[PDB]
């Protein structure tokens, strides 16, 4: 009765490392991403080590592509058990009056609508399967951290996410669906690191950390496999009493920023 | 002293317009429906103070720009923003909530919050400071049981995040940004004519002594929330910024 | 016209709070560690129009608290308003190096103090048929965790908020509102404490080239500021507010 | 090598489950409790199932006993790597004005002073050893739930515990010590079973849950083995980047109460 997971934003970072992690537990993985070739490459690697995997190309904020990806995946394997809502962008960070409506919309569409679409379309199958496990990947931003220069839209979306998670934990417990949130700090790259960041000087409260600001690793970002490991635990039956909890994975950086 | 208050046709918005006008604050009552805000403006001019009624859908760039331009062109400046406009939208099980229903709750409560702040911050900067309050809820902040209320929960939780980013971003411009978080006001907690399948989503519970401890039973008054906003946009609160405040008579802890 | 007990009233937030509450036709019992100070505020309250009494007592001591609350009901007949506001910073040190008595002392004053202050005043407030309580906490333990070696303090400030919320629900039917106040730096810098050791061992080094109190370009908040909020929270202007924390930090806290 | 753990409250419930869960990954265990015999059978069970354990009798509010127990464990196995501060008592729940100062003192001494003592004594050994992992078992009370009838004193100490965990995550990051808080809901017994509960009708907001108040389990409280599992995850290397975090294990309940 081998378990099935949809993992979004699987083409890289945490999503990718998550996909490997779970494949290694013999979870068969639907790896959905915005770029065919990246998601093909991870599905390949998974099959290369004798796993099961479909690459699914889709834009997470698009209703039709998503329905088509979900239907596709259930058809190939028969059931759905595990969902990781990981797709997100940072989008534009800029002064509240410089951030344009259309660029606000875009961060809301991928990060926020994508979460709604992802769940709406998968919850039916989970309900039918008799239960499963959901994790949505949020952030320290909007939960513990409010300093990332002009990141309001992102922040808004990331706070929304943990709220969705707790609402649904309750809605879905009677259906034996566990819903958790995972909140990373900087993974792989600096917290501030966005090429669509504009006008840092206006938004940043200036600050120097002579000894880094990620205490457990001595200033260094956490790594994709770290988040992977956590999601792997939370989607397993080892976490069978855990629902509607966030879990911060920031090496202490949340408490700092 | 000039205030823009959105969702000002009724409820908290109407009550805040009145309370603030009573402190001598020129009010720009803004709302979905013209006659509602005309009436609130009229009562204010009628009772002594200065006002103007502004008809805009809060999710709409264009109306909002006009609405803001017009308020600034009639009174000179901006000092206070109460971002209050919003909707419950449809509450339904996550699988029954439609994409377009989801989009509409986000459009009004979230995008409308963005736009409201997006357009008023330059004026508050020019004036050299001011006070913002965004009206959230116990939903998304303490309370996660309101049935199928996901989209709404989302927006309310988002707002508090916005408030804290903006408190830090704007502190140096002397703009204070706070979040007010009422429990049930006027109407009770789960009264929404667009609720579907409440059966399937509420976790069944009974409250023999009620679940608003301080008013043992009934919801709070719009004028209550108005009082809080009044305090929070006043000089009495000069050092308060980036704080949420729960006005739920304890209901937030129960639910 | 109603009566309020203010602990820690000899100075700081306490004093400011006694003053502002007077300036509202509120009769104050100023309770402090050291009489010279509290009779000094009480004197200033009287003859400047208002009713007031000074009370000497240590919050962590059962008998004195029982004593002094008795003494304040006798003189004015009732209690309407308690403001629990007495604390020490106490010793801040590495958890490694902080000592049991030092730890113990910060629990006595801040935690046991607050339990006692409410233990012996709730009953009169119920009898009055309702009133208002506010407990003065801190960004420490609520939003802030970098104050070097302040664990003990942080423990008690965090417990205060928990207490507020528990009793807010327990005392709702008695029409007693219960709220928290959580100041950032007031009058003084946030790591300013003469009983702090091994700062460099404990503190994560950080430089704030432009301050870390946004609304003030980096100057600590003022006692009157906090007082004003307390004054709001005890008035009937806030009839519906109970079981809530309110942060008064000028944004620091989102920052520390 | 083989790491050494100190688990306090290892007599029964979560502590005993934890000791066994830890021992199963080959961790050496100092099982510590108030009553010698309870921790004798958890030690003796691990030993002769292959493990290494020793029983440590101590009152967690007493400096000298705690110091000696901690010291014994280091003398026996040479180092300390893991610490699960779990000892705690419900104490007396009563109206605020009914609750006697001495019985207030009792709850603080055991719950709070016992946490300080547990950490103060163990931390030097973790430093010395060059790293390690700590978890304090707090509760949904004081963090999410505030309705447990007149449980003020208890609630107060649990909320302090999670605040300490965060200070200490920051203070000990550079020393490579992770410190997280686990907050279970009801486990083994209902949320409200306390023989020293007193005037519960005067303190409860009356409430009825026709379908129960713990979603993921159709109203039943979680198992000790559940909490142990979380603790096991959090003290291992699968959690290298997690520190400073609460985690709720309440099957939804904390969101209800």
Tab-separated table of C-alpha atoms in Angstrom, chain B residues 5-196:
chain	number	residue	atom	x	y	z
B	5	UNK	CA	-11.788	55.583	7.825
B	6	UNK	CA	-12.702	52.731	5.507
B	7	UNK	CA	-15.749	50.481	5.887
B	8	UNK	CA	-17.221	53.556	7.502
B	9	UNK	CA	-20.871	52.879	6.525
B	10	UNK	CA	-21.738	50.871	9.665
B	11	UNK	CA	-20.465	48.828	12.560
B	12	UNK	CA	-17.013	49.615	13.850
B	13	UNK	CA	-16.322	52.001	10.982
B	14	UNK	CA	-19.407	54.141	11.535
B	15	UNK	CA	-18.776	54.210	15.278
B	16	UNK	CA	-15.134	55.193	14.905
B	17	UNK	CA	-16.002	58.004	12.500
B	18	UNK	CA	-18.398	59.401	15.110
B	19	UNK	CA	-16.098	58.977	18.122
B	20	UNK	CA	-13.151	60.597	16.260
B	21	UNK	CA	-15.260	63.409	14.865
B	22	UNK	CA	-16.264	64.034	18.496
B	23	UNK	CA	-12.535	64.597	19.276
B	24	UNK	CA	-12.473	67.281	16.542
B	25	UNK	CA	-10.948	65.114	13.816
B	26	UNK	CA	-12.012	65.765	10.203
B	27	UNK	CA	-13.415	62.423	8.937
B	28	UNK	CA	-13.288	60.965	5.435
B	29	UNK	CA	-15.936	58.219	5.779
B	30	UNK	CA	-15.238	55.710	2.986
B	31	UNK	CA	-17.433	52.808	1.909
B	32	UNK	CA	-18.944	50.409	-0.638
B	33	UNK	CA	-22.357	52.170	-0.656
B	34	UNK	CA	-22.726	55.958	-1.128
B	35	UNK	CA	-25.869	56.658	0.947
B	36	UNK	CA	-24.510	54.833	3.996
B	37	UNK	CA	-21.426	57.037	4.132
B	38	UNK	CA	-23.451	60.126	3.087
B	39	UNK	CA	-25.585	59.583	6.142
B	40	UNK	CA	-22.557	59.182	8.441
B	41	UNK	CA	-20.912	62.242	6.940
B	42	UNK	CA	-24.185	64.254	7.268
B	43	UNK	CA	-24.704	63.368	10.949
B	44	UNK	CA	-21.102	64.574	11.572
B	45	UNK	CA	-21.404	67.908	9.688
B	46	UNK	CA	-24.955	68.105	11.082
B	47	UNK	CA	-23.619	67.654	14.632
B	48	UNK	CA	-20.793	70.241	14.363
B	49	UNK	CA	-17.609	68.686	12.871
B	50	UNK	CA	-16.295	68.491	9.283
B	51	UNK	CA	-16.660	65.372	7.079
B	52	UNK	CA	-16.896	64.017	3.525
B	53	UNK	CA	-18.357	60.785	2.226
B	54	UNK	CA	-16.273	58.668	-0.168
B	55	UNK	CA	-17.619	55.931	-2.302
B	56	UNK	CA	-15.048	53.308	-3.150
B	57	UNK	CA	-14.628	49.599	-3.399
B	58	UNK	CA	-11.515	49.047	-1.314
B	59	UNK	CA	-10.010	46.375	-3.620
B	60	UNK	CA	-10.171	48.677	-6.612
B	61	UNK	CA	-6.947	50.662	-7.411
B	62	UNK	CA	-8.732	53.358	-9.275
B	63	UNK	CA	-11.643	54.202	-7.035
B	64	UNK	CA	-9.148	54.193	-4.125
B	65	UNK	CA	-6.777	56.562	-5.772
B	66	UNK	CA	-9.680	58.895	-6.552
B	67	UNK	CA	-11.072	58.493	-3.098
B	68	UNK	CA	-7.747	59.342	-1.584
B	69	UNK	CA	-7.006	62.223	-4.019
B	70	UNK	CA	-10.393	63.696	-3.299
B	71	UNK	CA	-10.006	63.508	0.462
B	72	UNK	CA	-6.600	65.125	0.278
B	73	UNK	CA	-7.762	67.823	-2.200
B	74	UNK	CA	-10.644	68.850	0.120
B	75	UNK	CA	-8.878	68.890	3.490
B	76	UNK	CA	-5.163	69.457	2.796
B	77	UNK	CA	-3.455	66.565	4.569
B	78	UNK	CA	-3.668	63.108	6.096
B	79	UNK	CA	-3.018	62.203	9.777
B	80	UNK	CA	-4.954	59.113	10.616
B	81	UNK	CA	-5.901	55.977	8.724
B	82	UNK	CA	-8.337	53.413	10.033
B	83	UNK	CA	-8.222	50.445	7.623
B	84	UNK	CA	-11.405	48.701	8.611
B	85	UNK	CA	-13.172	47.748	5.360
B	86	UNK	CA	-13.716	44.003	4.924
B	87	UNK	CA	-16.016	41.021	4.416
B	88	UNK	CA	-16.598	37.547	5.876
B	89	UNK	CA	-17.065	36.295	2.285
B	90	UNK	CA	-18.143	32.691	1.980
B	91	UNK	CA	-17.243	30.225	4.673
B	92	UNK	CA	-17.293	26.652	3.474
B	93	UNK	CA	-15.200	23.471	3.701
B	94	UNK	CA	-11.821	23.979	2.040
B	95	UNK	CA	-12.875	21.623	-0.854
B	96	UNK	CA	-16.202	23.483	-1.368
B	97	UNK	CA	-14.865	27.029	-1.102
B	98	UNK	CA	-14.528	28.081	-4.725
B	99	UNK	CA	-11.394	29.702	-6.217
B	100	UNK	CA	-13.403	32.839	-7.068
B	101	UNK	CA	-14.806	32.972	-3.516
B	102	UNK	CA	-11.350	32.671	-2.109
B	103	UNK	CA	-10.175	35.413	-4.556
B	104	UNK	CA	-12.894	37.784	-3.351
B	105	UNK	CA	-12.170	37.515	0.368
B	106	UNK	CA	-8.490	38.143	-0.429
B	107	UNK	CA	-9.367	40.984	-2.774
B	108	UNK	CA	-11.336	42.863	-0.224
B	109	UNK	CA	-9.748	42.122	3.132
B	110	UNK	CA	-6.091	41.761	2.085
B	111	UNK	CA	-5.602	43.594	-1.185
B	112	UNK	CA	-7.865	46.276	0.170
B	113	UNK	CA	-5.670	46.588	3.227
B	114	UNK	CA	-2.603	46.848	1.040
B	115	UNK	CA	-4.136	49.514	-1.185
B	116	UNK	CA	-5.385	51.488	1.789
B	117	UNK	CA	-1.893	51.698	3.230
B	118	UNK	CA	-0.161	51.900	-0.179
B	119	UNK	CA	-1.913	55.176	-0.909
B	120	UNK	CA	-1.982	57.017	2.428
B	121	UNK	CA	1.590	56.525	3.611
B	122	UNK	CA	2.974	59.300	1.358
B	123	UNK	CA	0.599	61.735	2.892
B	124	UNK	CA	1.396	60.766	6.457
B	125	UNK	CA	5.101	61.034	5.619
B	126	UNK	CA	4.611	64.517	4.162
B	127	UNK	CA	2.723	65.561	7.283
B	128	UNK	CA	5.696	64.257	9.289
B	129	UNK	CA	3.865	61.511	11.162
B	130	UNK	CA	0.508	60.009	12.014
B	131	UNK	CA	-1.350	56.992	13.302
B	132	UNK	CA	-2.632	53.846	11.558
B	133	UNK	CA	-4.905	51.201	12.922
B	134	UNK	CA	-5.840	48.101	10.910
B	135	UNK	CA	-8.943	46.176	12.128
B	136	UNK	CA	-8.337	42.421	12.305
B	137	UNK	CA	-10.168	39.855	14.370
B	138	UNK	CA	-9.701	36.949	16.827
B	139	UNK	CA	-9.962	34.753	13.686
B	140	UNK	CA	-6.437	33.955	12.506
B	141	UNK	CA	-4.873	35.407	15.608
B	142	UNK	CA	-6.304	33.466	18.650
B	143	UNK	CA	-9.290	31.683	17.166
B	144	UNK	CA	-9.399	29.017	14.562
B	145	UNK	CA	-12.879	27.435	15.020
B	146	UNK	CA	-15.240	29.749	13.073
B	147	UNK	CA	-16.627	27.136	10.516
B	148	UNK	CA	-15.127	27.073	6.952
B	149	UNK	CA	-13.803	30.572	7.601
B	150	UNK	CA	-10.359	29.727	6.129
B	151	UNK	CA	-10.105	32.563	3.587
B	152	UNK	CA	-11.242	35.063	6.207
B	153	UNK	CA	-8.817	33.620	8.821
B	154	UNK	CA	-5.974	33.996	6.256
B	155	UNK	CA	-6.688	37.717	5.675
B	156	UNK	CA	-7.062	38.514	9.377
B	157	UNK	CA	-3.791	36.733	10.162
B	158	UNK	CA	-2.123	38.516	7.225
B	159	UNK	CA	-3.189	41.914	8.532
B	160	UNK	CA	-1.426	41.519	11.833
B	161	UNK	CA	1.805	40.608	9.991
B	162	UNK	CA	1.382	43.713	7.788
B	163	UNK	CA	1.009	45.769	10.947
B	164	UNK	CA	4.261	44.625	12.437
B	165	UNK	CA	6.359	45.012	9.163
B	166	UNK	CA	4.947	48.518	8.733
B	167	UNK	CA	5.480	49.530	12.362
B	168	UNK	CA	9.246	48.928	11.817
B	169	UNK	CA	9.431	50.232	8.269
B	170	UNK	CA	7.598	53.432	9.182
B	171	UNK	CA	8.781	54.102	12.769
B	172	UNK	CA	11.458	56.539	11.539
B	173	UNK	CA	8.761	58.544	9.695
B	174	UNK	CA	6.881	58.792	13.040
B	175	UNK	CA	4.028	56.723	11.812
B	176	UNK	CA	2.611	54.364	14.399
B	177	UNK	CA	0.874	51.259	13.061
B	178	UNK	CA	-1.257	49.020	15.352
B	179	UNK	CA	-3.721	46.183	14.950
B	180	UNK	CA	-7.048	46.039	16.785
B	181	UNK	CA	-8.533	42.534	17.166
B	182	UNK	CA	-12.207	42.364	18.105
B	183	UNK	CA	-14.103	39.183	18.927
B	184	UNK	CA	-17.814	39.225	17.975
B	185	UNK	CA	-19.163	42.767	17.679
B	186	UNK	CA	-22.895	43.535	17.259
B	187	UNK	CA	-23.510	40.184	15.605
B	188	UNK	CA	-22.260	36.936	17.112
B	189	UNK	CA	-19.171	34.919	16.110
B	190	UNK	CA	-20.448	32.710	13.306
B	191	UNK	CA	-23.325	34.642	11.792
B	192	UNK	CA	-22.640	34.860	8.042
B	193	UNK	CA	-25.432	34.559	5.438
B	194	UNK	CA	-22.858	32.906	3.095
B	195	UNK	CA	-21.883	30.032	5.401
B	196	UNK	CA	-22.265	26.639	3.668
